[PDB]
Design a protein around this nucleic acid. Structure first.
Lengths: 116, 227, 161, 125
RNA sequence: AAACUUUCAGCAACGGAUCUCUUGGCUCUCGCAUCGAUGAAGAACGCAGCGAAAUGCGAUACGUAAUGUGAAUUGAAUCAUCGAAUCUUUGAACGCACUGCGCCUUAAGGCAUGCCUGUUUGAGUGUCAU
RNA sequence: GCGAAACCACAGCCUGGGGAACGGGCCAGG
RNA sequence: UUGAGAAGCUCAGACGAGUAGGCAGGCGUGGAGGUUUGUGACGAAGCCUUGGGCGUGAGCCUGGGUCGAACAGCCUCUAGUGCAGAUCUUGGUGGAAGUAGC
RNA sequence: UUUCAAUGGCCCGUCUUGAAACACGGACCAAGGAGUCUAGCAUCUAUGCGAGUGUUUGGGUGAUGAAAACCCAUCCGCGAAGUGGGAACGCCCUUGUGGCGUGCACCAGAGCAUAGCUGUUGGGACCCGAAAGAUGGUGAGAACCAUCUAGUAGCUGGUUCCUGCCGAAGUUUCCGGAUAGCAGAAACUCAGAUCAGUUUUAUGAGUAUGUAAAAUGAGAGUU
RNA sequence: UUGACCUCAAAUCAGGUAGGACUACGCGCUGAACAAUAAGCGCAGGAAAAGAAAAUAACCAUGAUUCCCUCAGUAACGGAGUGAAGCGGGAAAAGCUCAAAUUUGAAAUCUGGCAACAUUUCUUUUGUUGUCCGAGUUGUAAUUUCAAGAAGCUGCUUUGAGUGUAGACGAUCGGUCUAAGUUCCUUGGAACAGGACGUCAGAGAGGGUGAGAACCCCGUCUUUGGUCGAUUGGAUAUGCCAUAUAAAGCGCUUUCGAAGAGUCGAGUUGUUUGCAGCUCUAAAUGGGUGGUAUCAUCUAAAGCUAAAUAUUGGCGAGAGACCGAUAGCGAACAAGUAGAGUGAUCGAAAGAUGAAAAGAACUUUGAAAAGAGAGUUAAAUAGUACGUGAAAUUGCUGAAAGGGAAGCAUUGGAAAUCAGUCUUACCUGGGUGAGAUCAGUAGUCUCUCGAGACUAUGCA
C-alpha cells in the first residue's frame, strides 16, 4: 500500500477552480468569512495570535451585532468560546467593528401588504 | 509501470523481473538558491556571443549582444510584423536554421506523439503581453517568456549554456529587479543576492602574464627540451 | 480491456463522446451585474477583487503574494465609532451609490392602520383619553384582545401617520 | 499549435478517427478544391465531392484527365471517374480510383441543397 | 579412379530471426453520476448481411418514427442525431410444474410472495349503551 | 504404402607407461 | 620553432604472473534534452559477403550484393541496457531412420 | 580464402578436493532470460548557503499547453545558543640566528539542504528449484479446482562487454565472533632519522645464544 | 334486537414498496494460515462514513466533523517490536431538529377519495382549491432545545413558501461561421523529395493523401467568441395579488425555567480501552472525563447535516523520457474465442502482397492437384505457402581433401582472389593576345579618411 502524489498539481488546480466557482456565485462578497483572533491553548504558543472559529456571543453583543444577523453578514458565531480576559474581548470587538466599517450591505426587497 | 496482474522472468508470457512501479522517484529536489544560481548563470551566458555560436545560434549578423529592441515590439499583432522585425535585426537566420532542421524523429519516439524534431530559435523576453506572444508563437523555434518567470529549460536547452535571447526595453530594465546585485537585494526575490565568484578577474592569462608576477619568477627553462 | 469496454469496442455503434475538457478556464460571473461588467475574465479572482477595490479575504493570506514591480483600553474600543471607510475605486462607488439609492427607495417602514385596527384604537382613545395607555390596556371590555401598553402606543403612532 | 484540450494530437487517436469514420463524416473527409474560376465565382475554396461533378485530375499517373465523377466510393476514400480506367488481362476495363484531394472541380453539380450550402460558406451564387 | 565421408562456395529449399511498422496494450491525470417488478445483469432462440469462432437487431427483427446532413450502399445512406413507438422465450422471474398443466373475467385482460396506508365485507361467550 | 520414440559435448584399431581415472582424447610403439 | 584541447606539449628512468578482492579508463543497446544550417527513393534501417581498412580489445568504418522508409555522430540525461550454459522458457530443425514397427 | 607440409595442441561450464580426478549440465540454432525499484542509517565526494539551513503540506501564479517554470505567509525538522610545528618577515657569504606561529599532537560554534558513490538494514529484494497450511467451492474417507502466496529452500543450479593497475590470506591468540596479521584508502610528520627472515666488533651468559654500538641496503615511523 | 369501541379475519379491493445485478472507492457482522489480513456474509451512494463536544487542556486558554503536513518513528506498551494523541501549520467551513413544561378562549395538524383549476424536461411531471371520509387527544400543529428559553412589560429596528412579463448574466444540448502554391525545372510507377520563385500565419498540433505537405484535404488558430434551436440557475427591474386583528430581532425583569434508565455503573467471562454475553442495577448541582495528589471542563443513554476527502468499477476526455507482436492485458486478428474437463474451472496459437488486384486473360500437358509457354507491375529476388527473409537444417551443382582423437595454433608453398600506391607538377625564358586587386584614371552602394562590393574607360 503506497499513496502516490501524482495528482498533487491536479488538486491544486481543482481547488483554485472551486474558489473561482464560488466567487462566480457570490460576486462582490469575500470568498471567506472573517475569523476572530485567539491565543493557542498552551504555554508554548500562548504568545502567538492565530485565527479562531467564530466570535463569542459577548463579543457580538459588545460590537452591536445580534447573533441572528451576524451569520447573515458573514460573521461566524462560536457559542463554545468565551472571553476569560478583557484583552480577548477588546481584540475581537475591534475586529468586528473594523469589519463593519468596510461593509456595504445591499438592501433587500420586503413585502408590504396594502392594508394594515 | 507494467500492470500488476501481468505475468519467471525467463519463461515466455511470464512476469518481468522487478516489475516497474509508479512510485519510483520521478521528481528531484534542488535548493531554490541553486536554481536561482543556475538561472542567473544562464542569463549571463546568453550575453556572450561566443557561447551563442557554440550552442548553434546563427547570430553572425546580429548587430549587438545582448540584443534589446523597443517596447513597440510588445504590441505586435501579426506574425508579419514579427518576421519583419526579425529580418531587420538579422535574427531571422536562426529561424531559417530551425525550419531547415525539421526532421522525423529516429526511433519509437515518433510512435509516441514525438513525430518531429528541430532546433531552438531566439528566445523573446518581454515585460507585458499586449500581442507579442501571439505574434511570435507561430514562428518556428521562437519561444516567448515573461521576464519575471525565466525558465532554465529555455535559458540552457539541453544543459548547454548560451541561448540567443532578444529582450524588449522594458524586460531589460527590469533585469536588475528580478536578480539584483551582489550587494543589493533583488526586489522581486526576497533576500536574494547575485552569487559572488571565488575569482575576481577570470582572465588567468592576464594574471600569469602580468608585470606583477613576471617580475619575480625565475628565468623560465626551455620548452620541450632536447634529448 | 474490461469485458464491458471490449463489448463497446467490438460494436459498430459510436461512442457517447462529450467535449468538456478546457482547463485554464475561469468561471463566468453571475449574481452582481456591476461586478460582471467590470470583471476581467483572464485575471484571477484575487487580481480582480484587488482591481475592483474589494477584499477577497477578511483574514490573512496563506502564502506569498505576487510582486510584479519593484515598489518604491476597553473604554475607547467598545465606545469609539468608526465613520465607515473611503471607497478606493469607482466600482465600489457604484456599489455604494446603488445601495443607498435602493435603501432610500425602499424606506417606507411605517404601517398604516387597517379598518379593524383604526376602529379598535379609536374606541379606546375616545374613552380613556390620549396620554394614559396603561389604563387603556387594563380595560377588559373595550380592549378585548388584551393588547399591552406598547401595542396600543404603536396603534396610536401608526394612526397619526 | 493547438491549444484546445478538446482536440487530440495523438497519432493513435487521429488515425483511428480517420479509418473508422462513419459515412457522414467520410463525406466531408473527401473534399476537393474548386478551380480558380469557381473559387472566385462561388467564394468557396473547397467542397465535398458529389456524383456527376466535372473534375480534372491534378496528380498521379492520370494527371490531366477530365471527366465526371461516376461514383464516390466512400468505403475506400476513392473517386471513380469516367473513362479513367485500366486494362485488365481479359480485356475488361477496371476503373481506377483517385483520391478526392488529387482532383480539382471545374464544374459543380448544382442543386437546391448545394446552392444553400454555397451561400452558407459565404458564397455568392 | 569411383563411391562414401569431410570441407568450402553457388543456386534451390526449410525456417521465421532482424529491421521498419501499429485503429493494441500499459501507466498517469481530468470531468461526470446514470441498473432493476414500468422486468435489470446474464442466458437462449430467431432475423439479414455475412467470414464468423464477429456485429447489429427483435416477428415493426442491419430496425420504425422524428430532427437532420444531402446522393449514396458496395430523400439515398451498412450515415449521424435522437424526446416518439416496438422490443421473441427466459432470467430477481411472478397463475402451478418447468414447454405442458390450470383458474376467473370480458383471442384479450389478468391470476407470485412479504410488507405499509386506506377501502369494503364478516366473525367474536370480547367491554359497554338502549 | 504408411511410419515412430528414447538417446546425442565430440571423435572412436590394440599393447605398455602417463603417479590425481589418465583414456577415448597424452607419450613410446605395433 | 610556431610543440597553450595546461584536460596540451615535452624529457628521463624503472617495471610488466595472478585466484578472491579492490580501483581506473573505455566499447555496445533502447528511450530523452541539445547539437551536426546531419544522412536518406540518385535508396534509410536490416540482412548477406573467400572485398578493403582501423583499434591490444570490447568494437567501429567501408566496397559489392540484397533491400525498400526511415536513421545516425557528438555533449548530457535515462534504463526492463550486452548470454553458451540455469536436467532454463518459447519456437524451429537435425542424427537415430526410412530404423522399431503397422 | 581452400588445402598441403613441419611443429605443437584434450571439452567447455559447474562442483569437488590440495589442484585434480571423478561426478554433474550441454543434439543443434534463433529469440527471451537473472543485484532491480523504494524507504531508512552511515561513509566519502561534489554543489548551494553558512550560525544558520531546508521553496513544492499548502497558497500565489502561470494567454497557449498550465502536471512544467516562477514567487512565499505562518509553522516545523535538524544545527547552534611549557615544547614540536605549516607559512611568512628581518639579519647571517650560506648554513644558521632573531621576532611571529595556523592545523594537529604534547604540557571563539559548523552545520543544513540536494545530488552522486559505497556499505548496510527492510521490504518478493539477483533469478530458479520440495510438499505447506488456511479460506471458499466442484465432484463423489480420499480426489479435484481457485485465491491468501513472490508462505520456502542455512542449500541446488545459473547469473550477460573489454582493457589496464593493485593484490592476498589460506592462521598466532582467546573463542559462531571479537581479534591480530596479511593487502589498500585517507590524515599526518619526517632525512641535522631511522629501519632491516643480513653479517658483524668484542664481552655477558650458556662452536651456538644474547648484548649495545660497525659494515651493507633502503628514506622511515606512524594514527 | 341495534349501536359504539376493541380484537381477530378475509378480499384478483384501491394506491405503493422490497428482492436481483454491479461493488474501484463506503459502512457493517465476521474471520484463518501467516492481521484486527485473505476469503465468507450483509448494506449503500456519487461519494460513503463522521459531525455541531457527557471534546481538549492546565494556557494570555482552545472550540462540530473530515482530510493533508507536523507532532513522531516521539510518549506509552513491551530489549526488540508495536505505535498514537493534545498543541501547531494548511484545505474546507454551516449549522441545526426533537423528547421532556396545558392551544385548552376552542386539533390550530395530517393521509386518502371525489370534483374543479393549474402546472410540466413530460398529454408521461408536479401541485393548488373545495367537499367528504379517515388518522389523531394513549397527542397531530404552533412554541422551546440549555448556545438557552418561557411569561409579562417596554420603544427601537424589521417582514411574501404568491403569480406574470421583459431584459441581462450563467450552465447544458444541438446546428452554423473560417488564411494561404498544388506555379517552374530535375528524379521517380507516384512528388509529399531536391532546386527556383512565392504566399498565409491569433493557423509551423496532429492525421489523410501513390515517398519528409503550414499553403491538396480534414482539421489547427481566432474560439477565454460571433450567430441562430431548445432547455433550464441565481438575481435584477417592473406590474398584479398579498388571509398584517399577523409574525420576528434587540431592552428590561417584585414571574418561571421541564433536559432522554435494563441506561450509567459494579462483578464476572471472552473478543479486541472499545464491543458483547451473563448476574445485579442507579443519581439530581446529579452524572461523565481530566488536573489534586478540591478545582477545571463537558452535559451521554434521541435525530439531521453541504464543503474540503476516497475512488483498479461505470459514462466520457486528454496525456506519456512506457511496450512494440516470445513485448505490452490472457486477448493489436476469432479472445475469455477455439479447445480441455462430468463439473468447479482452465484456456491458446494467430499482425505486414502492392500505389492500385492491375490477384496472372490466353495457348498447352495432365484424371486431378498442378506444370510450361505467356501476361500484370517500378519490382513477382512482392503471386495471397505473399514486406524484409538471419541461423540451425536439407537437396543439387562446382572445387578440393581423405587412414582414426579431431577441429585448432604457428610458418611458408601452391591454387584462387583482392587491395591501394603513378610524372605531374615545379622552376625559368620569350612571343602572342587577354584582365584588376595595375591606371601621372572617372562614378555608385554598404561599413569605418580607407575597408569591401560593383559600373564604365585604357591593357603601358
Amino acid at each position: 500500500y503506497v499513496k502516490t502524489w501524482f495528482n498533487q498539481p491536479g488538486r491544486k488546480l481543482r481547488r483554485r477552480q472551486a474558489r473561482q466557482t464560488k466567487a462566480a456565485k457570490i460576486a462582490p462578497r469575500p470568498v471567506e468569512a472573517i475569523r476572530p483572533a485567539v491565543k493557542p491553548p498552551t504555554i508554548r504558543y500562548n504568545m502567538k495570535v492565530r485565527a479562531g472559529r467564530g466570535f463569542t456571543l459577548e463579543e457580538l453583543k459588545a460590537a452591536g451585532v445580534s447573533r441572528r444577523v451576524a451569520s447573515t453578514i458573514g460573521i461566524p458565531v462560536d457559542h463554545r468560546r468565551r472571553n476569560r480576559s478583557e484583552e480577548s474581548l477588546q481584540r475581537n470587538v475591534e475586529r468586528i467593528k473594523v469589519y463593519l466599517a468596510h461593509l456595504i450591505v445591499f438592501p433587500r426587497k420586503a413585502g408590504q401588504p396594502k392594508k394594515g | 509501470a507494467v500492470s500488476e496482474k501481468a505475468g519467471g522472468n525467463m519463461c515466455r508470457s511470464g512476469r518481468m523481473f522487478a516489475p516497474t512501479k509508479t512510485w519510483r522517484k520521478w521528481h528531484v529536489k534542488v535548493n531554490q538558491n541553486e536554481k536561482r544560481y543556475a538561472i542567473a548563470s544562464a542569463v549571463a551566458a546568453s550575453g556572450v556571443p561566443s557561447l551563442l555560436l557554440a550552442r548553434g545560434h546563427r547570430i553572425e549578423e546580429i548587430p549587438e549582444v545582448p540584443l534589446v529592441v523597443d517596447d513597440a515590439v510588445q504590441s505586435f499583432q501579426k506574425t508579419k510584423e514579427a518576421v519583419a522585425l526579425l529580418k531587420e535585426i538579422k535574427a531571422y537566420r536562426d529561424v531559417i536554421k530551425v525550419a531547415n532542421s525539421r526532421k522525423l524523429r529516429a526511433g519509437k519516439g515518433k510512435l509516441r506523439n514525438r513525430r518531429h524534431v528541430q532546433r531552438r530559435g531566439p528566445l523573446v523576453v518581454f515585460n507585458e503581453d499586449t500581442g507579442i506572444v501571439k505574434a511570435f508563437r507561430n514562428i518556428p523555434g521562437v519561444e516567448i517568456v515573461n521576464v519575471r518567470r525565466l525558465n532554465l529549460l529555455q535559458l540552457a536547452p539541453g544543459g548547454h549554456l548560451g541561448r540567443f535571447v532578444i529582450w524588449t526595453k522594458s524586460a531589460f530594465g527590469l533585469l536588475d529587479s528580478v536578480f539584483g546585485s551582489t550587494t543589493e537585494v533583488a526586489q522581486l526575490k526576497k533576500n536574494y543576492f547575485l552569487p559572488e565568484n571565488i575569482i575576481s578577474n577570470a582572465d588567468v592569462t592576464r594574471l600569469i602574464n602580468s608585470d606583477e608576477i613576471q617580475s619575480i619568477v625565475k628565468a623560465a627553462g626551455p620548452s620541450r627540451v632536447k634529448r | 480491456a474490461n469485458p464491458r469496454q471490449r463489448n463497446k469496442q467490438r460494436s459498430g455503434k459510436p461512442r457517447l463522446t462529450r467535449r468538456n475538457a478546457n482547463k485554464k478556464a475561469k468561471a463566468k460571473i453571475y449574481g452582481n451585474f456591476v461586478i460582471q461588467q467590470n470583471w476581467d475574465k483572464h485575471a484571477t479572482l484575487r487580481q480582480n477583487y484587488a482591481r475592483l477595490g474589494l477584499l477577497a479575504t477578511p483574514n490573512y493570506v496563506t502564502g506569498g503574494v505576487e510582486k510584479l514591480y519593484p515598489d518604491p483600553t476597553l473604554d475607547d474600543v467598545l465606545d469609539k465609532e468608526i465613520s465607515i471607510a473611503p471607497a478606493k475605486t469607482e466600482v465600489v462607488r457604484q456599489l455604494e451609490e446603488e445601495a443607498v439609492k435602493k435603501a432610500a427607495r425602499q424606506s417606507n417602514k411605517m404601517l398604516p392602520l387597517s379598518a379593524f385596527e383604526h376602529a379598535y384604537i379609536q374606541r379606546l382613545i375616545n374613552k380613556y383619553g390620549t396620554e394614559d395607555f396603561e389604563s387603556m390596556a387594563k380595560d377588559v371590555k373595550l380592549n378585548s384582545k388584551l393588547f399591552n401598553g406598547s401595542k396600543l402606543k404603536n396603534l396610536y403612532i401608526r394612526m397619526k401617520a | 499549435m493547438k491549444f484546445s484540450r478538446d482536440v487530440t494530437s495523438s497519432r493513435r487517436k487521429q488515425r483511428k478517427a480517420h479509418f473508422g469514420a462513419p459515412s457522414s463524416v467520410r463525406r466531408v473527409l473527401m473534399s476537393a478544391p474548386l478551380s480558380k474560376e469557381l473559387r472566385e465565382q462561388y467564394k468557396i475554396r473547397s467542397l465535398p465531392v458529389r456524383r456527376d461533378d466535372q473534375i480534372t485530375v491534378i496528380r498521379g499517373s492520370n494527371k490531366g484527365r477530365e471527366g465526371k465523377i461516376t461514383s464516390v466510393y466512400r468505403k475506400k476514400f476513392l473517386l471513380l471517374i469516367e473513362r479513367v480506367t485500366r486494362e485488365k488481362a481479359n480485356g475488361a476495363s477496371a476503373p481506377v480510383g483517385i483520391d478526392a484531394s488529387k482532383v480539382v472541380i471545374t464544374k459543380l453539380h448544382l442543386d437546391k441543397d448545394r446552392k444553400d450550402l454555397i451561400v452558407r460558406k459565404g458564397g455568392k451564387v
